[PDB]
Specification:
heterododecamer; A: alpha+beta; Pyruvoyl-Dependent Histidine Decarboxylase, Chain B; 5-stranded mixed β-sheet; two-stranded antiparallel ribbon; about 25% helix; about 30% strand; globular; B: alpha+beta; Pyruvoyl-Dependent Histidine Decarboxylas, Chain A; 5 strands; elongated; Histidine decarboxylase beta chain (chains E, K); lyase; helix disorder; less active form
């Protein structure tokens, strides 16, 4: 997992990418409370985190060498064999994973939830996978929906997304989900200072992802949809 | 934001500043100023060949000691 | 797991329910040192924790939305199928779990131990399960007993308990054990104050669970044995 | 209690106070005053485990074994 | 050592002192003075008819896995 | 896992056993950068940690009763049966495990890595196991080598070692690896003081393991190769 | 004293009374640098401090019973005798005192100065005193002016004021100046919180004295010039 | 304000918060959060100085010159 | 000064000498509120502080070599000449000083006051001095009494005392008053610990000066009235 | 005592512990644990002879750097 | 130095570090790291028709007397 | 003041000017203990402090604009009149002042003492003043000597010095002594760091004043005796 009272999601709450209110649902689902909970593709958020941590080459604000980043994660690995296209059960043609974040309606009481899941796939036409995934969303979605009742907690919007890769040949393939829990560094906050801890936060809470980039002199990377997942 | 204001009177703050040059670090590691955390979303997938590469792609959380929370 | 030098068990050490010295063993077991270690049902302690955290409805002092409560736990889930009363191995008729705490004789040197274990059950008459469980205790018990020798550590009393539920129909059932490790909040301590950290502790260490409830104006919930497990 | 007194001379205290209104929080989370912890026992089951009887609901669990 | 000096200007120290008599304790436990850690290597095996307690003792510990 | 910018390895960086530069490789392996990375037996380091934590009997600076020592570890257990020398798959004749530490060439940027792995063995002649192990090293070794490229990080030396035990009769056997992450106590630092935190560190960083023992009045235990693994 | 880099003057820098830019000099004086330093009556500032600390009756944010408020001050006391209107030298007809604050042009380098002085008066017509005082200002003023050169520091405006009381009959009379150095309390800061230290400051730095009063529900006391000095 | 920003990079802050209900307290007294101070101007006289107009009453004064 | 909300007087509030309630006034004085304020000799309190700090020989808990003990004090020195028994004005036959502490009725609002004064004496018969002093008390006393009204603060008891010494021959003599403001050390608190700050205080607040001495193994020094002033 | 309890809710504590072996030290000196102070009463008088001795008598506040508060 | 070592076991350290760029500041001012102090000697004289500002500068300071 | 257990004197203990052991006494004086206490001119020390704080022009490590530097000091001012060479008592021809530091033999128990004194002078030939001063030293000196006995404290060496200026014409002249109590800044410590507090100190404790200057790239100012006093 969760993100609660101490939380802020890079992309939604701090460093907002414009895209987020520009967005529009894939659909809605009734909750036990009764509100139609909109579900949106998680492209903006994912993309945000890239801009901030950076890529192996374009290194920006990444977790320190040797640190202990507690995370919510699941992973999966398997082969799709040397040729022997016979399946010793932990093998598959393709691997897939997903994460889902549902912002709580009222952060004073209920906690925002992450739901992340993953697996392997036993067919080899991409369409079949693609299809399974877009289906899966609704499972996760209705799942987010009845999920609240134990907690008597209703959400406000769930953002969901995927990464897959189709294998062949005796390659091994891995797919993961990870929500990290970090603390921001000073120079990522323009005009922040180690003496101004909470003002430092409100600066990140007031810049849009664009703005942040400009003041930092960092070229975009989400920009024109250029990141695959 | 407004929420912080209603949140602070409970004793909860959401500051999460790290004292390192450039590097982010994790919730609970000593020396962090603040008592909150900042999270994000990362899902990526990749490849190796018979006889790391998820993590290092797209958003880097590379060379990290992961601790699972469920 | 363990609870060591920094430990206090809600119910035994702080917030004591009367029941605890009122109790009387189920039996005793020789240890390698030689003392007869009494084993008692863990009803009082379990019940205590409820009074303190509260129930989903009667919310009292529960872990904060979004916190990182490190815990010692194990869990278990399985179905008992749609009808197909044929067992694809991770299925069962009933699920069960248990926790056991053995307070160390000398907290200056040895650590108190938690032993928690769990599983699934393949018969469907409740008596058979019940029976397995009451047997199991002695296993855990003798286990607590020879357990010390590596550490050359002898205990003083082990408190052990269970939760099970018998399924049927294509329901999925879950059973868990969890020892949480928390820090207490100010208002759970009558006349406590953020400026009196250690005095705050000795107030909880000196009230009995009854007393605590009264000063807090909280109605009991253990009261007349009303909590199932 | 007496134990704390013999314990303190080793440098160990067992204070565990949280700065939040009403909420408990966990050992090691920043901002906790003290250097000890408080534990308890919970075992519950249901045919939804967590949320029954004693609530540790909506929590980020970290396993220690 | 020299490294610490180049390291400190980044804000990183590697002090890891525990306030307990005799006992070591772990990275992140409250009350530790410093912001670093000290590690070591332990591999041991044993059967009985007991890994941990042999050779190097990390006995009676609450382990937390990091991977 | 890793040991990064905040790290120091008992034995290599602090409390150095002489053995370490006295050592000489088992062999070398090309890395993608191109440097021949020497691989050495991890005897000295392992042995160091014993001198410092101590043994169940010769108790020296061990983790506090009840503490939360976050560790990198893997474990393994199985039986080699009552006689029924027929293998219900999670059983074996012998159990083995290993750890490997590769110090980073430049601690300002890349992180030192631990690689630890383990398993069980299905033959029962010791030579066959021994043999598998000495082979395995090279796997791990070449593994350490291509390992860097994702990170574009090259090492400087990997230190690797093992523990195994051969079973028979219905004994159960366990094998583990563990890198612990601790903070040192005051009295392990001769002339250290709670007011001199960083000086306290440089004292441990400047004594060799011998020296340390002498000032502390602790008899050696590595001494003349007397620790089995 | 001085008020330097750590400074903020109640009334000018935080909690501003409108009066201050509404004001207009009594005159100007050349400094060694060459800028005409405007001198203004210190009525607004003085009055501000009253609104904040409050009066013996209308108690608002006063120094804690028993605290150690370091201050810059000077005092003076004397009698004007039982009748014997013959002067044993430490006696006088009237007593007077003054304070003067000159805000530094550049707080990054030079420090703002307080100049406070006082005495007794040997005539008994009020006009003669009044007159001495209005003269005195210019002394203090030109004094502020050549004052800078040692420090090579030039000011930007000096604010100067007085308190006197004319005695008769065998009364003893006291006159003082005091600059206090305090730290503000939480509830004087509307929507301040002990967790938001620097934001708490910027709230006081952004309200005008009026505004502050309104949010706090405190009736004015400077209001329509009603405070004597 | 802007000044604080140019000031902070030198290591100087000007926060001065007291942890007492209602009461102000002085620069350097233990427990104050921040490393700055807040000052003001008071000049008053009477024919009993202190307690008039602006109260700094019942205070332990420490002179700085 | 004063002793306010943060105060505790060695002897009255912590470390109480029995004497204090055993005492009985010298007299009473009406206050503006109307309560008869009892005035008592300050022998017990003075004596207490000796037991705690100790004497140059019997060194107990004295201010650290080189510390900055802020104090309320006044001092006085003069000669009574080589023979020339002719008085160059700052000379005298005897020197005297006094301190007076008046505990506030309500420590939540008003502050306890110290009043200390001193001087020199121009006669040379001891009786005349003695006499002046016992008179003086009442001045100070009535002074404590009307003293409150500015603050609208009424006391509950004033404790007053003196030290004098009569000189002759070209000796120089000094007399002082001093209220110190200290923080107590750990070992003055039996069973105190640096980890138990507020409990440490309540131990000193609950022992009587006798008791304290016994647990510390310190022989008394006030004992049978043996300290001169 | 009871007063502390009514006092603490205002934010005031009266703890005053020094971290030195045996020695007392003064209000405000860095390293003191607590935010209160402890006071006492000392009045003593003494002698010297022509061409310290108050302080050092009876109760010792000897060798101290005094700071006046009035 | 050696003295500190015998001194520290009493609980006394003599560290006195200021967190300001270039500037020294005084014993007890909040934010100073350490619990000691550093002192020095200054005696200077000047007339004009100015003590402080000569030779060693302690200029623009709020002095607090200790005796 | 004194300089005690927390002390270090710029010049003697940290940042040592070579001069100090190069020095040689002016003379010696018996103490009550019996050791001959050497007295030396305080030129080196004084000069040190200049190098460190710097001069109004050559600004180096001076007290922060607006800080609260507690100091041991005494001052003196007077005129030597417009012509009227008639003396209204607070006037004089010349003004003088001095400071004296006597390092304690054993810093674990006794405190080092500063003795500073000052005045005005009523003759107008420089020789007469000069002379008075060199005499005065011995007074202060013998004074340092019998000074110890109250404390039963014996010194090890006293370092004493002076500043005077002879006036004429209606100039006013001031003379002062000041021992400041500061905390050192990071960049005055070559290779110091805010994370290494005590190591930072031992660097200043191990450089000689020369060395310090060189690493800092600061030209000397004491150099070839060029500072007047």
């Amino acid at each position: 997992x969760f993100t609660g009272v101490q939380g802020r999601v890079i992309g939604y709450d701090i460093l907002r990418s414009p895209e987020v209110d520009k967005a529009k649902p894939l659909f809605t689902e009734t909750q036990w409370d009764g509100s139609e909970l909109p579900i949106y593709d998680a492209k903006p958020l994912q993309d945000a985190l890239v801009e901030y941590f950076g890529t192996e080459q374009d290194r920006r604000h990444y977790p320190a060498p040797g640190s202990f980043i507690v995370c919510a994660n699941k992973g999966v690995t398997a082969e799709r064999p040397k040729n022997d296209a016979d399946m010793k059960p932990g093998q598959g043609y393709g691997v897939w994973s997903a994460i889902a974040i549902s912002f709580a309606k009222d952060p004073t009481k209920d906690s925002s939830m992450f739901v992340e899941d993953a697996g392997v796939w036993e067919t080899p036409n991409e369409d079949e996978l693609l299809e399974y995934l877009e289906g899966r969303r609704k499972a996760m979605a209705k799942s987010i929906a009845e999920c609240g009742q134990d907690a008597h907690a209703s959400f406000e919007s769930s953002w969901i997304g995927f990464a897959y890769t189709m294998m062949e040949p005796g390659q091994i393939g891995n797919a993961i989900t990870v929500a990290p829990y970090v603390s921001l560094p000073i120079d990522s906050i323009p005009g922040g200072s180690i003496l101004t801890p909470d003002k430092d936060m409100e600066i990140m809470e007031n810049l849009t992802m664009p703005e942040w980039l400009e003041k930092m002199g960092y070229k975009s990377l989400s920009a024109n949809n250029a990141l695959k997942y | 934001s407004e929420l912080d204001a209603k949140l602070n009177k409970l004793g909860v703050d959401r500051i999460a500043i790290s004292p390192y040059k450039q590097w982010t670090r994790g919730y609970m590691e000593p020396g962090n100023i603040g008592n909150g955390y900042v999270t994000g979303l990362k899902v990526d997938a990749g490849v190796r060949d018979k006889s790391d590469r998820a993590e290092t792609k797209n958003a880097y959380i590379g060379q990290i000691n992961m601790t699972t929370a469920s």
